[PDB]
């Protein structure tokens, strides 16, 4: 499958893609304003995500830090990032179909639009100012907005029992951004694609 990765932010991003043990294609590059980068993705991969990062410092190697979703210090990232992340979520080709979200369980950096290019289903989008309007116990110092389970590691925010319900903290993300994940146990906002769709990443859409 073919992703194709737009930074319309006036900010450089550096964007990054995993799948938790491993990079997908290069695994991370810079973008700067409008800027695509296009990656091809294994058909079957499941549990992939891809983000943006964030004031990122790296050196000739691809060694250095970012102050947003930083993948242990590296520009082509094998693992997922260090919270705030927006994450745009896949998994292709189970039984015939895609399955593709947003989600702000791990916290909100920069708006997403997630979008096919094929034929078949809708995007989803998380486009609204969370940064701005973050309360201000989850505001990340280094730039966006955490998650709870992030900031307190409670069971309840980390619905680490498996029974959690949603929380003021989760439901401001909600009410900001209704078609993203704002807790584990959140109503599903996936979405269903047919198998083999293609797809485009914006960020910034707006």
């Known amino acids: 499958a073919t992703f194709e990765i737009v930074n319309r932010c006036s900010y450089t991003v550096w964007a990054a893609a995993s799948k938790g043990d491993a990079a997908l294609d290069a695994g991370g590059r810079q973008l700067n304003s409008g800027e695509s980068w296009t990656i091809n993705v ?14 990122c410092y790296f050196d000739d190697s691809g060694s250095g830090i970012c102050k947003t979703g930083d993948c242990g210090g590296l520009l082509r990232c ?8 927006t994450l745009a979520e896949f998994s292709l080709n189970q039984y015939g179909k895609d399955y593709i979200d947003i989600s702000n369980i791990k916290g909100f ?20 100012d969370i940064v701005g ?40 993300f909600k009410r900001l951004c209704p078609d993203a994940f704002s807790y584990v146990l959140d109503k599903p906002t996936t979405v269903t694609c047919p198998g083999s769709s293609n797809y485009r990443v914006t960020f910034c859409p707006t």
Not at 44 to 55: E, L
Not at 113 to 127: K, L, M, Q
Request: with cysteine; glycine share 14%; charged share 20%.
């Open 78 to 85: 094998k693992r997922f990032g260090r919270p705030p992340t």
């Open 133 to 172: 309007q973050c309360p201000a116990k989850l505001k990340a110092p280094g730039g966006g907005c955490n998650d709870a389970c992030t900031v307190f590691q409670t069971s309840e925010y980390c619905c680490t029992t498996g029974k959690c319900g949603p929380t003021e903290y989760s439901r401001f």
């Open 42 to 55: 294994e058909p079957g991969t499941n549990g992939g995500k891809i983000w943006a990062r964030t004031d």
């Open 109 to 128: 950096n920069v708006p997403m639009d997630f979008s096919p290019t094929t034929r078949g289903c809708r995007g989803v989008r998380c486009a609204a």
